[PDB]
């Protein structure tokens, strides 16, 4: 709460009323920015279609009363250095509420001085129909751009913060790699793939003794230590196992909804039934649906929403990145041979809104996955081993003038 919020911030609110009845557009811009605070566009009263002409406005608030050199002819106000596009500097009185505009495309010799706004010809009245319109500029051949002077925007990021369990089970094994030990696992019961084997060492977020992996692990050498000694350490190997363990844990999780392509590194939605459409329900603060696993309408090919999930360690914290992609299948299970034309066709059409929606969908899927259902054994008695959470929105200092552009 600034000390000028009552005066400066609410001063522009009353200024808009004069322009609102005049019939000229007012587009919100930066409060204290270089060049403009609002935008004026002339409009046809009968139709309301745009005329392609713009003009900027800058307003600064003061106190009630008079200023230096003010008799009953005019007054004398100074323009501070920090304020292209010529702009009217509209003022505002408080004792009797008389706004005072003045041009900046005007050249009274050198303008580097005090702008003595006249009290007879600088009154901001509805006479601006042709008076102010004479100064308005156009976006034609001269090439007047719209500089971004706004309060910025809130941008989302692909990262999801991963909260690892406070304990990790590390143990030896008579096996070297998971490939050497996967045949040992499959012949037993209670098969679970969520583990990593390297350097004859066994790493898994679950206790190996409880589940069916007892054969591979030395059952007497199962020791639980904190993850900060295995994940957040400078050892290159330990990072690689954490990369492996995170994916497999994510792979075993969300298995009711996603499938993994072994040859690639691509996660994609699995198809219920055979060769039929599907849908997903994800958060935005709104309920949005999308054809996650959709068979085409023109033909029978099936397109599954896909993402390349990769893990990064930033600021001694583990993050998961989401890279939206697509997987094409003839009937939802068999990969579609020669998918280049279809894959490239869809990628060529998406824009910022489409990719952002896909990112939010995958963010919702993972963040909701860590949550547990109310009932016991509803999905699994142990809680999901990975808890994700959205990062706070990125606060950019400048905003894209999307409103000024077409559509």
């Amino acid at each position: 709460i600034t000390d000028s919020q009552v005066l400066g911030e609410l001063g522009e609110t009353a200024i808009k009323k004069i322009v609102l009845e005049t019939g000229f557009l007012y587009e919100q811009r930066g409060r204290l920015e270089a060049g403009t605070d609002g935008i004026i566009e002339l409009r046809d009263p009968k139709s309301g279609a745009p005329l392609g002409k713009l003009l900027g406005v800058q307003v600064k608030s003061t106190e009630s009363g008079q200023y230096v050199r003010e008799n009953d002819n005019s007054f004398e106000y100074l323009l501070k250095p920090d304020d292209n596009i010529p702009v009217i500097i509209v003022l505002w009185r408080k004792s009797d509420e008389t706004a005072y505009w003045k041009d900046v495309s005007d050249c009274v010799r050198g303008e580097e001085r005090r702008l003595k706004f006249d009290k007879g010809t600088d009154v901001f009245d509805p006479r601006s129909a042709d008076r102010i319109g004479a100064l308005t500029i156009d976006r034609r051949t001269p090439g007047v751009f719209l500089p971004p002077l706004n309060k910025g925007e809130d941008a989302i990021i692909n990262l999801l913060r991963i909260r690892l369990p406070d304990e990790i089970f590390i143990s030896t094994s008579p096996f070297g790699s998971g490939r050497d030990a996967v045949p040992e696992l499959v012949k037993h019961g209670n098969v679970r793939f969520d583990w990593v084997i390297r350097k004859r060492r066994f790493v898994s977020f679950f206790d190996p003794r409880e589940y069916g992996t007892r054969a591979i692990v030395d059952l007497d050498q199962v020791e639980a230590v904190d993850t900060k000694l295995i994940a957040f350490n400078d050892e290159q190997d330990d990072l690689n196992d954490t990369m492996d363990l995170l994916r497999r844990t994510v792979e075993r999780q969300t298995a009711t909804q996603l499938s993994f392509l072994r040859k690639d590194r691509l996660f994609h939605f699995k198809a219920v039934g055979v060769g039929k459409s599907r849908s997903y329900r994800y958060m935005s603060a709104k309920v949005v649906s999308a054809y996650s696993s959709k068979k085409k309408d023109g033909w029978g090919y099936v397109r599954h929403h896909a993402a390349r999930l990769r893990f990064e360690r930033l600021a001694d914290e583990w993050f998961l990145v989401i890279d939206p992609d697509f997987h094409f299948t003839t009937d939802g299970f068999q990969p579609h041979r020669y998918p280049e034309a279809l894959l490239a066709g869809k990628k060529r059409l998406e824009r910022n809104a489409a990719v952002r929606g896909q990112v939010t969908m995958w963010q919702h899927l993972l963040v909701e996955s860590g949550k547990h259902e109310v009932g016991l054994f509803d999905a699994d008695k142990p809680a999901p081993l990975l808890q994700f959470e959205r990062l706070p929105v990125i606060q950019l200092s400048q905003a894209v003038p999307e409103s000024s552009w077409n559509r």
């Binding site: 090439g143 990021i157 998406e350 990125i394 950019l396 894209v400």
Partner: protein
């Protein structure tokens, strides 16, 4: 905990100290940074009598002015002014008499009449190079030579269809081979297809045989082509506006290119630094070292000898070692490279150095709420690794010139770096505006990194140990 930033568009310098953020507008108002002594740029033309006459009319057509191809976005697609007071280069592009060499219809049939594609390209290069040697040693001495290839020659050389069976798939590139084989000539050369100086011309694509190639509007083509012609004539169009209190810095971009055998990997480097006064030097050199392999990275000795060479080139113009040396690389900096570079700096007494890996394959990205992507210059700090958006929504253009959302550049400085990532990102973003091969300033990659790759394409065909000119005009 990621701190955001939106850098202002770096200011470029034109004419007599004029400043602008757009190369086209700055050239239009103030003119080139280095003005030519004389109002005519003698351009030689090589091609069939149809193309030579066709391109010559185009050069005169640009003098009369070309209407903008899209009035809706007058900044992204501006109109070429012409010869008035808005002349972007303050010079006339004319073809003097006797500066044209005609490729006879017989000579075209010799190239088209060869079965194997590789032999046709080699035969064409010798044929063109012989004509090129005729122009330079003749009375009419041009400043830049424009090779206006005819449509039938383009079909044989590029699309290879007139095709024989594929043998490995490493088909020769006519442009790179031609540029390499004429590196000993004293005048730079420019290749121009007919569809750029004539909207009626249509060359079908190589694989998609039923579709012609889509080109920019005529005004945009004139802007990019004449700017390249002016640069190759021997003058710098524009330069980054230097801060008054800035360290004397030298930028060195390092890149790699596959050898002609397709397996080995060589190192191609480009160096950017502003000479004393109003000027900008862009050198292109290959590391004079013999350590052959497939590694996309340098060795300890290789990097040291490379940095020493770059410092000596800087010392030739300034007579003093640079205060700062920023090294941009296309691959991650390893321990042997960093200690190799540091050894070179210690011998030369360089104070500060930055080792930055410019990664383009990073999947990290941010998305604003709307139909358009984030602003160009958006920067996000990831624990030191910098996420920079050199491409995106450009307020000056009024739109985002791209198909899909832009992929941000991820800057990964090595631990042996001085400046903060925010400072480095501001320099990397500024370096994208001095490519000089195009007048559109929303370039994705910094110039030293981009210039290194462009040098690599030409140098695949130059045999090792052969001395070649380091002027970037011979590679752009």
């Amino acid at each position: 905990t990621f701190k955001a930033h939106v850098f202002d568009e770096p200011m470029l310098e034109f004419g007599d100290g004029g400043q602008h953020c757009d190369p086209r507008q700055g050239l239009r108002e103030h003119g080139p940074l280095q003005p030519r002594s004389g109002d005519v740029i003698r351009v030689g033309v090589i091609g069939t009598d149809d193309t030579v006459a066709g391109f010559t009319e185009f050069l005169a057509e640009t003098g009369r002015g070309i209407e903008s191809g899209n009035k809706q976005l007058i900044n992204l697609n501006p109109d070429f002014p012409g010869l008035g007071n808005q002349n972007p280069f303050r010079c006339k592009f004319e073809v003097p008499d006797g500066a044209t060499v005609t490729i006879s219809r017989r000579q075209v049939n010799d190239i088209t009449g060869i079965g194997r594609h590789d032999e046709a390209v080699r035969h064409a290069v010798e044929l063109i190079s012989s004509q090129l040697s005729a122009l330079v040693e003749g009375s009419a001495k041009p400043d830049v030579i424009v090779l206006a290839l005819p449509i039938p020659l383009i079909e044989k050389l590029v699309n290879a269809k007139s095709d024989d069976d594929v043998d490995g798939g490493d088909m020769l590139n006519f442009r790179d081979l031609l540029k390499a084989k004429t590196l000993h000539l004293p005048v730079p050369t420019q290749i121009v297809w007919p569809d750029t100086w004539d909207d009626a011309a249509k060359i079908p694509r190589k694989i998609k045989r039923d579709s012609n190639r889509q080109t920019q509007v005529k005004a945009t083509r004139a802007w990019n082509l004449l700017n390249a012609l002016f640069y190759k004539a021997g003058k710098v169009p524009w330069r980054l506006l230097p801060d008054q209190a800035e360290y004397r810095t030298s930028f060195l971009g390092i890149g790699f290119y596959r050898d002609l055998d397709g397996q080995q990997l060589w190192t191609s480097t480009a160096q950017m630094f502003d000479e004393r006064g109003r000027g900008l030097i862009l050198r292109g050199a290959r590391a004079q070292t013999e350590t052959r392999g497939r590694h996309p990275y340098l060795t300890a000795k290789d990097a040291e000898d490379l940095v020493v060479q770059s410092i000596a080139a800087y010392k030739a113009h300034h007579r003093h070692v640079p205060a700062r040396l920023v090294v941009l690389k296309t691959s991650r900096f390893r321990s042997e490279e960093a200690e190799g570079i540091d050894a070179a700096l210690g011998k030369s007494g360089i104070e500060m150095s930055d080792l930055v890996w410019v990664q383009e394959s990073s999947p990290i990205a941010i998305f604003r709420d709307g139909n358009y992507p984030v602003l160009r210059g958006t920067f996000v700090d990831l624990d030191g690794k910098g996420l920079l958006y050199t491409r995106g929504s450009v307020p000056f253009y009024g739109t985002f010139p791209g198909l899909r959302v832009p992929r941000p550049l991820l800057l990964v400085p090595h631990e042996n770096s001085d400046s903060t990532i925010l400072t480095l990102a501001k320099d990397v973003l500024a370096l994208t505006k001095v490519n000089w091969n195009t007048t559109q300033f929303d370039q994705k990659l910094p110039a030293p990194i981009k210039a290194a790759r462009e040098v690599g394409r030409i140098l695949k065909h130059v045999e090792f140990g052969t001395a070649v000119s380091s002027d970037f005009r011979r590679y752009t």
